[PDB]
Amino acid sequence: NLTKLLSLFSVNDFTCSQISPAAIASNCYSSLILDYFSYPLSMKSDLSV
Amino acid sequence: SDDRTEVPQLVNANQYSPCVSIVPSTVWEDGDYYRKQLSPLEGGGWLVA
């Protein structure tokens, strides 16, 4: 339950590549990797694919 | 339409493949792939070959 996890936080931006945020909640996968770290909203333009 | 159930479309006897609408009469290069998004009436999701 990922919409569970994202209900704890206040979410400011959600962009995906080769998928959508809608799609990434729904689908099943053989492997999911979650990377997390501290990061300022001021530097959003630098956190881009 | 869940973006990650894949269902092979098998050809029935005395019929053409459902993919003949998206696969050229001659394939340009070995391994080329074709896609076509489906209308909600057609079932949603995609057709792929």
Q: What would you say this structure looks like, in words?
A:
The structure is cut from a larger assembly and holds 2 copies of chain A (49 residues). Chain A is an all-alpha fold. Chain A has helices at residues 2-8, 21-26. Chain A binds chain B through residues 19-20, 23, 26-29, and chain B through 2-5.
Instruction: Tell me which oligomeric state these chains represent.
Output: part of a larger assembly
Share of residues in helices of chain A? 25-40%
Assign an overall shape of chain A: globular
Helix/strand class of chain A: mainly alpha
Strand % of chain A is under 5%
- Work out the number of β strands of chain A: 0
Gap from first CA to last CA of chain A: 25 Å
What integer value in Å does the Rg of chain A equal? Answer: 12 Å
Note the main sheet of chain A: none
Question: Order of SSEs of chain A, N→C?
Answer: HH
Instruction: Supply the number of helical segments of chain A.
Output: 2
PDB class: viral protein
Keywords: MERS-CoV, prefusion, viral protein
Entry title: Prefusion structure of MERS-CoV spike glycoprotein, conformation 2
Chains A, B: S protein
Please specify the SSE layout and strand pairing.
The structure is cut from a larger assembly and holds two copies of chain A (49 residues).
Chain A: H1 2-8, H2 21-26
Provide a concise account of the structure shown:
This is part of a larger assembly, with two copies of chain A (49 residues). Chain A has 49 residues and is mainly α. Chain A is built from two helices and no strands.
